[PDB]
Structure formats: C-alpha cells, structure tokens
Enzyme design. Structure first.
Site, mmCIF file in Angstrom:
data_model
loop_
_atom_site.group_PDB
_atom_site.id
_atom_site.type_symbol
_atom_site.label_atom_id
_atom_site.label_comp_id
_atom_site.label_asym_id
_atom_site.label_seq_id
_atom_site.Cartn_x
_atom_site.Cartn_y
_atom_site.Cartn_z
ATOM 1 N N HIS A 72 -8.298 2.357 -2.984
ATOM 2 C CA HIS A 72 -10.045 3.377 -3.398
ATOM 3 C C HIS A 72 -9.877 3.345 -4.367
ATOM 4 C CE1 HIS A 72 -9.053 7.332 -2.618
ATOM 5 N NE2 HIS A 72 -9.960 7.636 -3.379
ATOM 6 N N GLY A 103 -10.305 13.713 -7.275
ATOM 7 C CA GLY A 103 -9.442 13.300 -8.813
ATOM 8 C C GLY A 103 -7.277 13.504 -8.390
ATOM 9 N N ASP A 108 -5.132 2.380 2.573
ATOM 10 C CA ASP A 108 -6.054 2.889 1.190
ATOM 11 C C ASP A 108 -4.533 2.662 0.594
ATOM 12 O OD1 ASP A 108 -8.062 3.870 -0.454
ATOM 13 O OD2 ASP A 108 -7.023 5.176 0.167
ATOM 14 N N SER A 123 -6.691 11.855 -5.209
ATOM 15 C CA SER A 123 -6.546 10.258 -4.845
ATOM 16 C C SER A 123 -5.026 9.363 -5.765
ATOM 17 C CB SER A 123 -7.494 10.071 -4.638
ATOM 18 O OG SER A 123 -8.864 10.766 -4.028
ATOM 19 N N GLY A 124 -5.034 8.768 -4.589
ATOM 20 C CA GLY A 124 -3.676 8.394 -5.474
ATOM 21 C C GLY A 124 -2.347 8.615 -5.508
#
Ligand SMILES: O=C(C1CCN(c2ccncc2)CC1)N1CCN(S(=O)(=O)c2ccc3cc(Cl)ccc3c2)CC1
Ligand SMILES: [Ca+2]
Length: 223
Positions: free
Chosen positions: A40, A175, A84, A177-178
């Site tokens: 994403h 923020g 994801d 995320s990942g």
C-alpha cells in the site's frame, strides 16, 4: 508510534525511510540491495533513505539510494489490504556499517505472546496530528489469532497478525506503515493497518512476513 519511546540514534539500523519529497512510509533492509515494505506504500519514483535517525536533519550518516525496481505482491488487494507486501530494489548496494545493517528473514512464524519491536516516524498522537523528527520505538506482544479475529470480525486473514494492546494506549499509527516488527532479530511483520491508533480493543494489524519467505527469496534471486 503512539505510546512509544525514542529508539536512540541508529539503534534500529535496518529501518529505512521511503522518501518522495516527504517521508510517506517506512521499510526494512533485508540485504545489501533489497528493501521490504507494504504494498500500500507503492509509489513510482521512491528514494530509499538509510542511516536516518532524525529525518529532518542531515546527520551525515545518511545514504539516499533511488529505487530501481518495485515488486508488489500479485495477489495484493487494496480493499482488504491482504498481501500488503512489496519488495524494492536499490539502484546501488547500500554500504553496510553500524548505522546501516540488514534484518534477517524468519524461518518460522512467531507465537502469541512474543515481544516484538515496532518502529517509525509516524503519528504519535492517537488524537491529533504530531510527527516526530527522530525514530520512535514500541515494544508490543504478538496477539493470538483468536484475539485478532475477535477484534476485527471478518477482516483478519491468514496473512495478518495483531500486535499491541486491547487496552490501546500503545500502537503504531499513520506514517509507520511499511515499517518493521522485529521479534528476536527476525523480521516477523510489516506495519499494515489498524482502525485508528492506540484504540481500545483495536490493536494494529501487520503483514505476516513468515508467510512470504519463499516468495521473497525467489523474487530476490530473479531480479
Ligand atoms: O490516522 C489515520 C489512519 C492511518 C492508518 N492506520 C494505521 C493504524 C495502525 N497501524 C498502521 C496504520 C489507522 C489510522 N488516518 C487519519 C489521516 N487520514 S488522511 O487524511 O488520509 C492522511 C494521510 C496522510 C497524512 C500525512 C501527513 Cl504528514 C499528515 C496528515 C495525513 C492525513 C487517513 C486515516
Ligand atoms: Ca537525517
């Protein structure tokens, strides 16, 4: 990271910043030339910033390597955020040292109760909007799938796991995320989603990386 603490300069060496003008997502360095993140967070033209502690100040330990290839999982669904996971190849090899180091992949999935380190430069407020300059850390236990599925009815898939607290207070956030979720030195999860930040009975959901170890290895070799 809501409810977190300052990691401390280069204490999380495998943590990278996916830049595209501003910091939009986090990520992990798995080896000299490959970075793992969330599907994403896919954007064309990413700059992978390494050796960063304070994102806003050039502390000289940084390394900014452009992405040469972005490989999102084929079964990735934006609606469900299932699968994801995304791999990014660095244009040139990162110079590994003390500030920059890789994180190993898992050989087995973790059990509920396992303590993991979750980090990033994402929102620290579950209420308003506040973004740190330096790297924040949070220690959270991997919750059982029973808790995860009861927290998110009909939303948790076999490729997801909950980590955090049903009492809220502590959790990842926008923020982050990942970013990496490392338990015992192995990359076990990727900051994927959650309903709000640090919400009661709503702990953050992460991508169960141990499920993709095979995929990752074949992807890394072929490209
Ligand atoms: O906080 C959130 C979500 C973000 C995703 N999410 C989690 C929860 C737990 N772990 C990872 C992600 C749940 C909370 N939102 C508020 C902001 N909106 S937004 O208007 O789209 C948005 C997106 C990016 C932003 C970036 C900045 Cl720097 C400032 C405001 C921003 C606002 C999206 C939902
Ligand atoms: Ca910096």
């Amino acid at each position: 990271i809501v409810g977190g603490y300052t990691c401390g300069a280069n204490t999380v060496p495998y943590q990278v910043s996916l830049n595209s003008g501003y910091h939009f997502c986090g990520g992990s360095l798995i080896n000299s030339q490959w970075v793992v993140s969330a599907a994403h967070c896919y954007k064309s033209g990413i700059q992978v910033r390494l050796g960063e502690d304070n994102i806003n100040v050039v502390e000289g330990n940084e390394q900014f390597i452009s992405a040469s290839k972005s490989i999102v999982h084929p079964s990735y669904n934006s609606n469900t955020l299932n699968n994801d996971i995304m791999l990014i190849k660095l244009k040139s090899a990162a110079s590994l040292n003390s500030r920059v180091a890789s994180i190993s992949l898992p050989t087995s999935c973790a059990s509920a109760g396992t303590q993991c380190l979750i980090s990033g430069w994402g929102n620290t407020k579950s209420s308003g909007t506040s973004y740190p300059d330096v790297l924040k850390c949070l220690k959270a236990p991997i919750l059982s799938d029973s808790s995860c599925k009861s927290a998110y009815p009909g939303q948790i898939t076999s490729n997801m796991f909950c980590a955090g607290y049903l009492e809220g207070g502590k959790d990842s956030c926008q923020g982050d995320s990942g970013g990496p979720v490392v338990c015992s030195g192995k990359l076990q999860g990727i900051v994927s989603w959650g309903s709000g930040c640090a919400q009661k009975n709503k702990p953050g959901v992460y991508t169960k990386v141990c499920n993709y170890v095979s995929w990752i290895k074949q992807t890394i070799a072929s490209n």
